[PDB]
Amino acid sequence: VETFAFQAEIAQLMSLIINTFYSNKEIFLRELISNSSDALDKIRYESLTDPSKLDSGKELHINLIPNKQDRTLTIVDTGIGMTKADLINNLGTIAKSGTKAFMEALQAGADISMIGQFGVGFYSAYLVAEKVTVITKHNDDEQYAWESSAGGSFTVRTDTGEPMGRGTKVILHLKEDQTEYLEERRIKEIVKKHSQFIGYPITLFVEK
Numbered sequence: 001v002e003t004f005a006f007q008a009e010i011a012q013l014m015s016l017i018i019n020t021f022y023s024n025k026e027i028f029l030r031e032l033i034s035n036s037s038d039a040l041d042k043i044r045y046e047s048l049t050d051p052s053k054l055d056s057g058k059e060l061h062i063n064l065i066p067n068k069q070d071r072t073l074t075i076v077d078t079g080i081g082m083t084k085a086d087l088i089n090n091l092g093t094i095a096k097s098g099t100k101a102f103m104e105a106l107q108a109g110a111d112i113s114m115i116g117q118f119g120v121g122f123y124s125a126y127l128v129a130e131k132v133t134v135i136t137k138h139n140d141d142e143q144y145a146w147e148s149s150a151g152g153s154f155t156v157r158t159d160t161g162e163p164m165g166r167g168t169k170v171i172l173h174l175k176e177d178q179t180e181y182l183e184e185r186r187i188k189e190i191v192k193k194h195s196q197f198i199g200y201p202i203t204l205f206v207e208k
């Protein structure tokens with residue numbers, strides 16, 4: 001298990017998301033589904049010139065899996081997935097500029113729900129989650145697990161759990177007072193409101 005410090009800007013963003021009073025937390029789901037859609041767009045496009053990129057799975061979709069026993073909501077996609085370099089360096093580098101702009105916009109009267117316009121919507125996960133675990137598998141790289149409970153650091157390890165084929169699973173370990181996001185009725189409401197035109201099947205799993 002390797003431990004890394006967030007860039008200062010991202011640590012600042014995470015603290016803002018965690019500490020700001022903002023009741024409209026439900027937008028986290030729209031943001032993560034949007035991320036998934038983008039990742040699915042990417043593998044679909046790449047597969048047009050290299051069909052073998054789908055050897056790791058032809059189906060392009062999104063699953064939403066609530067688990068009341070673990071108090072987790074998992075967003076699974078079969079998108080392009082992320083390399084180790086993506087997890088540690090690439091995405092954080094691109095996120096630095098978007099974070100700065102988002103910060104500036106907020107100071108100018110924007111609100112947290114506009115986070116996606118700055119490309120850092122993933123971090124809206126911390127509106128509802130005390131810890132986020134990301135399991136990801138890109139073609140030609142290993143399956144990794146990224147994890148952070150904020151506090152300025154994240155970890156990355158090679159993942160030994162069930163192999164995924166290709167894609168990303170975002171596991172939201174929900175805050176004690178945010179369990180409404182495990183309810184079927186609530187998730188359906190949010191998907192209908194904010195994600196009705198996503199171009200991939202979204203399956204909301206039901207609890208046993």
Ligand SMILES: CC1(C)CC(=O)c2c(C(F)(F)F)n[nH]c2C1
Nearest residue numbers: 087091092095119120122134146
């Ligand atoms: C575990 C991540 C790599 C962290 C991160 O920084 C990020 C972003 C961001 F960079 F766009 F914010 N999008 N998706 C992710 C997942």
